[PDB]
Design a binder for this molecule. Structure first.
Ligand SMILES: *[C@@H]1O[C@H](CO[C@H]2O[C@@H](C)[C@@H](O)[C@@H](O)[C@@H]2O)[C@@H](O)[C@H](O)[C@H]1NC(C)=O
Length: 372
């Protein structure tokens, strides 16, 4: 299945229209991962445009964060331009002042453009935070956070490195072979999400193909997959050695390891960061109609609760848009409530979060203005 991407554009702080900042384009909900993105100054691609390693969500769709530093002027258009097969012309979204899990996850994506070429990325998260990555060239574990070692010995991991290195190297080789037997259509990608967690059961490992639950761990085919999975599971159910290997790795090794990542994290896990919030007038929807927007940002951990107010009286029109990430492993949420200019004054916006601890940030309105 193919899924047209969802460009979302937002800054990290507000513009005072003068002071240096980051811009975020965040692209998600898209398959296949062969994408091109760019950021724009008035028509112009920039350069020191950083982005995170690729990844994918519980529905196999992919997602990314593209960002750069820069300062704003009262002139100066900004926008996020994205091209991707399912699109019929680069859908460029414009920026605006006025807007517009205690489990160790190892995720892999191996893409297969043709017999000649292939490529794979792989990652190693813990809950929301990516703990590890893979060096494809040098064939080795990029550790990422410092405590990403856990209490696994220097030598302990040195081995796993290899046990993956073979794995990764085998995987491409084998599939490329199997390809025709099982009528895998080039180009195609195969995703995998394996790991530890809980506390009943413990293990897991799912393996989509063209963005679709295809195969899972004995080995079971997915109904939707059809005969292909059905077949592909046979070949695999028969290799007991393989079953057993993983059974040991994900069974009791990786959870021992999880235990490890968990206890070694703490100081950065039990970590709290105060938000920051401000105020818009997103586009007036129709006649004498306002649309004040909230802008909580820069907070961690994720769970945040946010309401447009008016004293203690919760305003139930508050719409709560998605939680994007900023680059500094923090969050950003934009809550929005729209009502007639007369209903407008007196409105607050209240931001509950663990980092404040009892003292919810309250943010009132004098348009297009904002305290405290
Ligand atoms: C096999 O595909 C190869 C990879 O093509 C990729 O290159 C990217 C930069 C992108 O633009 C897409 O074209 C692909 O994801 C390529 O090196 C070979 O020419 C292809 N071989 C044949 C025989 O068609």
């Amino acid at each position: 299945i193919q899924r047209t991407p969802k460009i979302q554009v937002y800054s990290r702080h507000p513009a005072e229209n003068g002071k240096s900042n980051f811009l975020n384009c965040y692209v998600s909900g898209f398959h296949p991962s062969d994408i091109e993105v760019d950021l724009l100054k008035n028509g112009e691609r920039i350069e020191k445009v950083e982005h995170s390693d690729l990844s994918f969500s519980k529905d196999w769709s992919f997602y990314l964060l593209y960002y750069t530093e820069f300062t704003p002027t009262e002139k100066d258009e900004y926008a996020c331009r994205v091209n991707h097969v399912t699109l019929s012309q680069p859908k460029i979204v414009k920026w605006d002042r006025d807007m517009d899990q205690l489990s160790f996850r190892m995720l892999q994506t191996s893409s297969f453009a043709n017999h000649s070429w292939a490529h794979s990325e792989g990652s190693g998260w813990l809950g929301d935070l990516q703990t590890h990555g893979w060096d494809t060239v040098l064939g080795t574990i990029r550790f990422l956070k410092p405590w990403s070692h856990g209490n696994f010995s220097k030598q302990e991991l040195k081995n796993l490195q290899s046990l993956f290195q073979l794995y990764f190297h085998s995987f491409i080789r084998i599939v490329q072979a199997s390809a025709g037997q099982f009528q895998l259509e080039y180009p195609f990608e195969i995703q995998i999400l394996a790991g530890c967690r809980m506390n009943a059961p413990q293990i897991f490992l799912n393996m989509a193909y063209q963005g679709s639950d295809f195969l899972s761990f004995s080995w079971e085919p997915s109904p939707g997959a059809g005969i292909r999975a059905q077949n592909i599971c046979k070949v695999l159910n028969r290799y007991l050695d393989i079953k057993e290997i993983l059974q040991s790795l994900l069974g009791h090794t990786c959870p021992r390891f999880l235990a490890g990542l968990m206890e070694a994290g703490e100081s950065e896990l039990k970590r709290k960061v105060k938000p920051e919030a401000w105020l818009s007038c997103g586009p007036s929807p129709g006649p004498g109609r306002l649309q004040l927007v909230c802008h909580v940002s820069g907070f961690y951990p994720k769970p945040v609760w946010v309401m447009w107010m008016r004293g203690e009286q919760e305003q139930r029109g508050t719409q709560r848009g998605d939680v994007l990430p900023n680059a500094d492993e923090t969050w950003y949420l934009r809550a929005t409530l729209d009502v007639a200019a007369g209903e407008a004054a007196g409105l607050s916006c209240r931001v509950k979060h663990s980092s404040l601890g009892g003292h919810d940030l309250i943010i009132h309105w004098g348009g297009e203005n904002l305290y405290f």
